Each structure stands twice: as structure tokens, then as C-alpha cells.
Design a protein around this ligand. Structure first.
Ligand SMILES: *[C@@H]1O[C@H](CO)[C@@H](O)[C@H](O)[C@H]1NC(C)=O
Lengths: 50, 49
């Protein structure tokens, strides 16, 4: 049999993510912008952006 | 028969349409038109080259 006669104390560092960044988007100024000619056309595509 | 060929680039304009120019208005959400470049926004004095 093998039995230790001494010992050592070690400190271990481990990392793991918890959260990401929160983001938000606006369809009416991404798809069109300030163009009111295509705001009414984007209105005809339903409720994807909701 | 007369065939007309058009070219629309970033070059300065030579042949251009008849429209009545107005006065420049800054710091106001307006609709602009410069060379056939209609849009919507505010106009601010620049420092770009
Ligand atoms: C155990 O290890 C420590 C660290 O190296 C040392 O100071 C100590 O003397 C050792 N014990 C024996 C009994 O040799």
C-alpha cells in the first residue's frame, strides 16, 4: 500500500459567463428609416416586428 | 427616331430638370431634394472634406 506523508494546498481559478448584453431594435427606422412611402407598405406585412 | 441615353453618377450635374429652388432651412426635420436625392432629416453645417 502507498500512504502519503505530506500534503500541499492549492488554489484553482475557473471562470464561466453569467449574462450577455441587452439589445433592442426598431423596425420602422431599420427597414425604412424616415421614408413614409414604405411605412404603409411595412404595415401590410403583419405583426412580425411585434 | 431619337434615342436619349441617361447617366446618373456622383459627378456634377450637367443636364437637369426645371424646378423652383427654395431657401435652405437648418435644424428642422424637413424633406430635401438636391440633385434628385430626395430624403427626410435635419441639415447641419459640417466639417467633412
Ligand atoms: C511538507 O511540505 C512543506 C512544503 O514544501 C514543507 O515545508 C514541510 O517541511 C514538508 N513536511 C515534511 C515532514 O517534510
Amino acid at each position: 500500500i502507498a500512504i502519503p506523508t505530506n500534503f500541499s494546498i492549492s488554489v484553482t481559478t475557473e471562470v464561466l459567463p453569467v449574462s450577455m448584453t441587452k439589445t433592442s431594435v426598431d423596425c420602422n427606422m431599420y427597414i425604412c428609416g424616415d421614408s413614409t412611402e414604405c411605412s404603409n407598405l411595412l404595415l401590410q406585412y403583419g405583426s412580425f416586428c411585434t | 427616331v431619337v434615342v436619349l441615353s441617361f447617366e446618373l453618377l456622383n459627378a456634377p450635374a450637367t443636364v437637369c430638370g426645371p424646378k423652383k429652388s427654395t431657401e435652405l432651412v437648418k435644424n428642422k426635420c424637413v424633406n430635401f431634394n438636391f440633385n434628385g436625392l430626395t430624403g427626410t432629416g435635419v441639415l447641419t453645417s459640417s466639417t467633412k472634406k
